[PDB]
Amino acid sequence: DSTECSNLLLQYGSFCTQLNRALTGIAVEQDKNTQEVFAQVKQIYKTPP
């Protein structure tokens, strides 16, 4: 809730941006793990009676 949000953001935003990029890459990686383990075969088949 700072008054000078623009000045602090301009000074220190790229550091947080690269850290957030790294953490977002981690999250996308976890999605890649879920796709790797659960979507090996994409042929969705009807559940038999």
Residues at the site binding other proteins, with contacts judged by CB under 8 A: 6-7, 10
Decide whether 7 or 24 has the Cβ nearer to other proteins.
7
**In whole angstroms, how close is the CB of 6 to other proteins at the nearest point?**
5
**In whole angstroms, how close is the CB of 13 to other proteins at the nearest point?**
11
Per DSSP, the three-state class of 3 is coil
Residue 9: Cβ within 10 Å count: 13
- Could you give the C-alpha distances from 5 to 12, 15, 20, in angstroms and in order? 10, 15, 18
**In whole angstroms, how close is the CB of 9 to other proteins at the nearest point?**
8
